[model samples]
Target chain A: ALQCFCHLCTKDNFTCVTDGLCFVSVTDKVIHNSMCIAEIDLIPRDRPFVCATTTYCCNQDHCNKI
Target chain B: AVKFPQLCKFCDVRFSTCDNQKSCMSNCSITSICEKPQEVCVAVWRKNDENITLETVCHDPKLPYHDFILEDAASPKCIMKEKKKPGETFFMCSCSSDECNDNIIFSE
Candidate 1:
């Protein structure tokens, strides 16, 4: 199910209603719950990228499953 | 023993044996009876023998759809055809964000 949420704007720095969700402007893939924890950049222009683990246990066993 | 037979009790369409036919792949998850060839099997979607007759072939990734068996006691080989319009035969396959709850009945 898609639940509504709020986000802060980059220019004004004030909370703004997201246009459905957070996304990487480069790839256009929806930023899921798993992407939030990565320490790397959210938007990348290259093929190989690094992302921090968003899960409680760094998604160790979970990431391997996928 | 490898073949699957789908009998329609309401239409009296008893496909005693659907040998190597492809149409039967849609209703394969359950066990069905066997019948003789050249037999008329009854179902609402009865237009051509091509549409009704089925064969037993292994289909790994099954399509999401509903199936039923007519097995009426009076006519053991007969399968029930719901009293509805020709195209409205309850067979459905749909998907959505919400849950789907449907029933499949095979009467003995």
Candidate 2:
């Protein structure tokens, strides 16, 4: 099992159940109040950068804090 | 040994890190040597309100849709119209020399 951080409103670290790595995705403006931090199966490819958007992945503890 | 072009490496305030300030210091100011001859040093600067984000990396000009422009617009859009007032501004520049991306200034 793997672990990751899950949070809302801001960045935070939490434990998650998974077999892969930690992932982080940030989008400016939080479209439709959709901004959040949660466990994901895979990094989405269509992650847009329309307005200060970013997505990252890591394989270390607390790597998804940021 | 063959010589490679060096690129300026600096990434602070990326969407990947949730735009965290502390994460910006992580792996900041690294000197990278590009492996491919076509790779060019790239610097991307984005300013929104008082917050500004800067990223430098090796970019391949050959990549499809490598060239781009930035402006202000609605969500789910890439490249928007320049705003008349305070708005999001994205600037990206590239060079072909070692550490050529160290210092760059974006002008209209």
The superposed Cα distance between candidate 2 and the true structure at residue B21, in angstroms, equals 21
Off by over 4 Å in 1: A1-66, B1-49, B52-83, B87-90, B97-108
Over the stretch B23-103, how does candidate 1's per-residue lDDT look in tens digits?
A: 222243333221431122222222234444322221111221124332322232223333433443332122110111011
Expressed as tens digits, the lDDT of each residue in B1-108 for candidate 2 is: 112334445453453221432122223457755666456666555677677666667666665222453221111211112223236765555566555556553322
Could you give the DockQ of candidate 2?
0.01
**What TM-score number comes out for model 2?**
0.37
Write candidate 2's Cα lDDT for A1-66 as tens digits.
555454452533335545544446655346222222333433332221211155454544555533
- Give the number of the best model, judged by lDDT: 2
The estimated TM-scores of all candidates read: 0.17, 0.37
lDDT of candidate 2 vs native? 0.45
